[PDB]
Design a protein around this nucleic acid. Structure first.
Ligand SMILES: [Ca+2]
Length: 276
DNA sequence: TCGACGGATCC
DNA sequence: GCTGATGCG
DNA sequence: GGATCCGTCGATCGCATCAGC
């Protein structure tokens, strides 16, 4: 059926109020997103950090609009080495980061403008747009190598600070994260492989799926629908966009939300509340 | 995601 | 700037 | 032999490039 995201639990497990609001969103064309009034929604939601994926836009072609955009003064972008109009991500922050890193530190996996690291005082934040296993699973082979590297770099990372990873992970973890599971079991995004990966990643690093940590059994809660075949109309979507918390931060987690009613892409923005 | 094709297999 | 076509997802 | 089963396998909607002029 349809999903109604619950109201915002702005208090910790321990009564301490939320201090830190990170928002994440696969934009799918940053210029079209802004033309489609997405930045309005950003302004009204007033996050402390905004992460975007699928920006499909190069550094200089970046629009003027997000220059004026206040409260998200520090802005960082990666966009692929040699392929224009493709991929790209960006991280905007109200407060200034301690240190910003691009890519995951392997050549093979750092050429498509997918990953921004940003270390803050008490945590480190990664935003990524995981590569699609490709239609016809033509790039499935690659993405098993991506996953294994993303893992071993995310594990190294968490070893030092506690981390929040957000972004589009291109994996529909379980059959509850998919409107049509059985008609998708070797479509990309729900292969035995990619769900296998997600599982390794949660057990490897380790990381909790914050949405499923608070709503382990809510169905029909989705983050993406194809513009085709009326997919968002019937909410026949997926859950592709996660907030993957280190276990240290589980006592800081106040809520984890999915802002379905927010138009402008084929994805909807998600939103994390922590007490930090 | 959807519907058209298949080629089966069923009462 | 404009038309076509192709890429990606 | 006709009506239902379940595996394929074809155009859709959107964003952005590219070639060419
Ligand atoms: Ca292609």
């Amino acid at each position: 059926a349809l999903y109604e995201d619950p109201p915002d639990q702005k208090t910790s497990p321990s009564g301490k109020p939320a201090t830190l609001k990170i928002c994440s969103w696969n934009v799918d064309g940053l210029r079209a997103w802004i033309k489609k009034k997405g930045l309005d929604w950003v302004k009204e939601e007033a996050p402390d950090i905004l992460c975007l994926q699928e920006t499909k836009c190069s550094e200089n072609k970046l629009p003027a609009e997000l220059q004026e955009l206040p409260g998200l003064s520090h802005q960082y972008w990666s966009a692929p080495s040699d392929k224009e109009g493709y991929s790209g991500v960006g991280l905007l922050s109200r407060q200034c980061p301690l240190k910003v890193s691009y890519g995951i530190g392997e050549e093979e996996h750092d050429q498509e403008g997918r990953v921004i690291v940003a270390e803050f005082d008490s945590f480190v934040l990664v935003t990524a747009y995981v590569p699609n296993a490709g239609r016809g699973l033509v790039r499935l082979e690659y993405r098993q190598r991506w996953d294994e590297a993303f893992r071993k770099f995310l594990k190294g990372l968490a070893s030092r600070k506690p981390l929040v990873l957000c972004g589009d992970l291109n994996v529909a973890h379980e059959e509850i994260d998919l409107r049509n599971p059985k008609g998708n079991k070797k479509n990309a995004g729900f292969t035995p492989q990619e769900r296998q990966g997600f599982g390794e990643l949660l057990q490897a690093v380790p990381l909790a799926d914050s949405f499923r940590h608070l709503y382990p059994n809510t169905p029909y809660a989705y983050t993406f629908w194809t513009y085709m075949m009326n997919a968002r109309s019937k909410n026949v979507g997926w859950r592709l966009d996660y907030f993957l918390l280190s276990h240290s931060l589980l006592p800081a987690l106040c809520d984890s939300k999915i802002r379905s009613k927010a138009l402008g892409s084929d994805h909807c923005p998600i939103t994390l509340y922590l007490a930090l």
